[PDB]
Design an enzyme around this catalytic site. Structure first.
Site, short mmCIF file in Angstrom:
data_model
loop_
_atom_site.label_atom_id
_atom_site.label_comp_id
_atom_site.label_asym_id
_atom_site.label_seq_id
_atom_site.Cartn_x
_atom_site.Cartn_y
_atom_site.Cartn_z
N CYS A 99 3.03 1.48 10.00
CA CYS A 99 3.03 0.37 8.86
C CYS A 99 4.49 0.12 8.51
CB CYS A 99 2.10 0.54 7.45
SG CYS A 99 0.32 0.94 8.06
N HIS A 120 0.84 -1.36 0.00
CA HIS A 120 -0.07 0.05 0.00
C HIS A 120 1.04 1.22 0.08
CE1 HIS A 120 -0.57 -0.34 4.61
NE2 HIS A 120 0.12 0.98 4.33
N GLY A 126 1.99 6.10 10.53
CA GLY A 126 3.48 5.94 10.22
C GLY A 126 3.94 4.60 11.01
C1 LIG Z 1 -0.03 2.45 8.41
C2 LIG Z 1 0.20 3.74 7.29
C3 LIG Z 1 -0.27 5.03 7.70
O1 LIG Z 1 0.09 5.47 8.92
O2 LIG Z 1 -0.64 5.66 6.75
C4 LIG Z 1 -1.08 7.06 7.22
C5 LIG Z 1 -2.36 7.20 7.99
C6 LIG Z 1 -1.29 2.70 9.19
C7 LIG Z 1 -1.44 2.13 10.66
C8 LIG Z 1 -2.54 2.68 11.26
C9 LIG Z 1 -2.39 4.14 11.65
C10 LIG Z 1 -3.06 4.46 12.96
N1 LIG Z 1 -3.08 2.81 13.57
C11 LIG Z 1 -2.60 1.97 12.80
O3 LIG Z 1 -2.48 0.89 12.95
N2 LIG Z 1 -2.33 2.07 8.26
C12 LIG Z 1 -3.26 2.61 7.58
O4 LIG Z 1 -3.57 3.93 7.96
C13 LIG Z 1 -4.08 1.89 6.42
C14 LIG Z 1 -3.45 2.39 5.37
C15 LIG Z 1 -4.08 1.70 3.96
C16 LIG Z 1 -4.40 0.45 4.13
C17 LIG Z 1 -5.12 -0.26 2.71
C18 LIG Z 1 -4.88 0.22 1.61
C19 LIG Z 1 -4.34 1.81 1.54
C20 LIG Z 1 -4.21 2.40 2.73
N3 LIG Z 1 -5.52 2.13 6.64
C21 LIG Z 1 -6.20 1.91 7.72
O5 LIG Z 1 -5.40 1.42 8.73
C22 LIG Z 1 -7.52 2.27 7.51
C23 LIG Z 1 -7.91 3.01 8.93
O6 LIG Z 1 -7.19 4.48 8.75
C24 LIG Z 1 -6.96 5.23 9.68
C25 LIG Z 1 -6.16 6.47 8.95
C26 LIG Z 1 -7.88 5.80 10.67
C27 LIG Z 1 -5.78 4.60 10.67
N4 LIG Z 1 -8.44 1.10 8.03
C28 LIG Z 1 -9.32 0.44 7.26
O7 LIG Z 1 -9.88 1.52 6.31
O8 LIG Z 1 -10.19 -0.40 7.61
C29 LIG Z 1 -11.17 -0.87 6.84
C30 LIG Z 1 -12.67 0.05 7.05
C31 LIG Z 1 -13.44 -0.23 8.05
C32 LIG Z 1 -14.33 0.44 8.22
C33 LIG Z 1 -14.79 1.65 7.37
C34 LIG Z 1 -13.96 1.83 6.37
C35 LIG Z 1 -12.84 1.19 6.25
#
Ligand SMILES: *[C@@H](CC(=O)OCC)[C@H](C[C@@H]1CCNC1=O)NC(=O)[C@H](Cc1ccccc1)NC(=O)[C@H](COC(C)(C)C)NC(=O)OCc1ccccc1
Ligand SMILES: *[C@@H](CC(=O)OCC)[C@H](C[C@@H]1CCNC1=O)NC(=O)[C@H](Cc1ccccc1)NC(=O)[C@H](COC(C)(C)C)NC(=O)OCc1ccccc1
Lengths: 306, 306
Positions: free
Chosen positions: B145, B41, B143
């Site tokens: 990931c 990603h 940050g």
């Molecule tokens: C690591 C990458 C990162 O920091 O990107 C900038 C935000 C991050 C790890 C999480 C941050 C906070 N705690 C964590 O463990 N990972 C991500 O942000 C994921 C990025 C991503 C995944 C797949 C494709 C493209 C990008 N996204 C998620 O974790 C996301 C939640 O986003 C945040 C910003 C709130 C953390 N989760 C998600 O989309 O789950 C599916 C879902 C569930 C319900 C409604 C909509 C979607």
């Protein structure tokens, strides 16, 4: 999100662990530059752990009385001296893995990471608080003496603890890296007991702020308290008195959440008096007291989940 | 004595953490020999995290699309490929700090250490269990990931987890080091939820044995149970069914304590039905399920405090 007891990464410390042997006694030592630090009880005779006179025991030793092993490499001891309850062994080689470091004496209620070690080999890492009664609730077996506690800021290791003994209640006692004991304890196997302990109020409050930052507000209430009225309740439940300094330390967390410290104290007062009603806070059924305000700021988001 | 959630020493893993940047997205990577592993990603456009086609996104990249930083050193990417939900980047330099290592897919109920990392810099280490619902209860911020989970046996690092996402309940999902997700999750920001979780019965029993080894027997009773009668109670309290294999795994702990597994099951049945009566076990007011039988054997004395 989430909230865990989190230790510092241990690599910089692992590179400093060695084995120290005198006679048939082996324990861990800490190798920094050209010095190895270890508990002085390594020189105790097998027959006398009750009344050792360390000055008399040490004067009977030469440099070659001490064997120091770093991995599979023998380090030649070229000098020795006692500093309080530690020995400082000078060796022929400076540790090439010596990190930037300081020796710090930590204060009660503060936390540190422990690198549990056996025969100079690191086995595990976990987080501890220095209890008000100057013990730690560690996890240590035979062979663990000389294991160290530390914190890390940027790339500097602040060593704060070296492990010496276990008390009857299963808790742990040791020294700073100047060899001065935390608490009234002495390194002899004469009867000793930990004093009565107290709950670290400042830490409980910090952890309630952590819970709010992470999105949970269930335990708040419409009330406030004075510092003195809070302290009357604190005494009843064996909590440390809250001071204005503790209130000031909580400023940043208060600001991030918009919850005044004395309002959080009112919330805590209610939790003490009423219990938690089958509910949890940050996955805990009890009030956690081993996270400092600094620990909460280190681990939680700087943005509150409002 | 004592019993703590204990992580493995993290040094061997710290030496493998790097930063991977594509466009404006930065996350952590794992550098082993001449390969850097990271979540795929990292290549998502800022505009599309909902429906990325990774094959179409990747074919548009060159080797020089990727920047890899190890400390202050730039590593030149000389090849790339996708493996499931990870990218494998070939670099111009083999990591001189590569430990002996294996990639392992861990099983539900098993534990591992997590090295939380930001911008290629390790920040903390803690212990996690793989939940029955294939999530972990971690502690991660933006940050994080590409942070990895691992176990260590002798001097070999078994990598088992790389971090990808957070779910609505605040729990965490990720992949093994072949890039295959734990659980039914996908790396797109389409609505997903963790399945209902269950308590890891085997671990609760292991932890009751830990409590006996360490000297506490208060929760035992005069009764026994059949496996099937225990399981009727387990279903009621949302515990995993106990199997004969789980009974066999508990053999060594049973032998060390002299408490038959089904007798410990009777004790557990009583704790579920009656509660703990204001008492604690190993300092816990609840039944802990994140220590495996292996974890108990690793940490506790081999001699029971009788
Ligand atoms: C690591 C990458 C990162 O920091 O990107 C900038 C935000 C991050 C790890 C999480 C941050 C906070 N705690 C964590 O463990 N990972 C991500 O942000 C994921 C990025 C991503 C995944 C797949 C494709 C493209 C990008 N996204 C998620 O974790 C996301 C939640 O986003 C945040 C910003 C709130 C953390 N989760 C998600 O989309 O789950 C599916 C879902 C569930 C319900 C409604 C909509 C979607
Ligand atoms: C480290 C050294 C070691 O392993 O020696 C071989 C046993 C060890 C660390 C403890 C082992 C188990 N958990 C630990 O944290 N330290 C010791 O064994 C201490 C050795 C020592 C101290 C001072 C002078 C000389 C030797 N001794 C103790 O911790 C001792 C308890 O002994 C064990 C074997 C049961 C752990 N504690 C003690 O004597 O406290 C004072 C006391 C209290 C009540 C009655 C009598 C004495």
């Amino acid at each position: 999100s989430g909230f865990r007891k989190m230790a510092f990464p241990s690599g910089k410390v692992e590179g400093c662990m060695v084995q120290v042997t005198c006679g048939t006694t082996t324990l861990n030592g800490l190798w920094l530059d050209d010095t190895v630090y270890c508990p002085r009880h390594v020189i105790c005779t097998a027959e006398d752990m009750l009344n050792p006179n360390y000055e008399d025991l040490l004067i009977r030793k030469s440099n070659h009385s001490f064997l120091v092993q770093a991995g599979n490499v023998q380090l030649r001891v070229i000098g020795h001296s006692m500093q309080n309850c530690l020995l400082r062994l000078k060796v022929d080689t400076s540790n090439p893995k010596t990190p930037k470091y300081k020796f710090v004496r930590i204060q009660p209620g503060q936390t540190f990471s422990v690198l549990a070690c056996y025969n100079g080999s690191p086995s595990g890492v976990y987080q501890c608080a220095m209890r008000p009664n100057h013990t730690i609730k560690g996890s240590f077996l035979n062979g663990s003496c000389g294991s160290v506690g530390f914190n890390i800021d940027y790339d500097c290791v602040s060593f704060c603890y070296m492990h010496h003994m276990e008390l009857p209640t299963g808790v742990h006692a040791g020294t700073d890296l100047e060899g001065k004991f935390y608490g009234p304890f002495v390194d002899r196997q004469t009867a000793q007991a930990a004093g009565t302990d107290t709950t670290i109020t400042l830490n409980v409050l910090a952890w309630l702020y952590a819970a709010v930052i992470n999105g949970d507000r269930w335990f708040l209430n419409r009330f406030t308290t004075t510092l003195n009225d809070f302290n009357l309740v604190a005494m009843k439940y064996n909590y440390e008195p809250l001071t204005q300094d503790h209130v000031d330390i909580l400023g940043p967390l208060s600001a991030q959440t918009g919850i005044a410290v004395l309002d959080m104290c009112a919330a805590l007062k209610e939790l003490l008096q009423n219990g938690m009603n089958g509910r949890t806070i940050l996955g805990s059924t009890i009030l956690e007291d081993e996270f400092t305000p600094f620990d909460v700021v280190r681990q939680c988001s700087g943005v509150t989940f409002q």
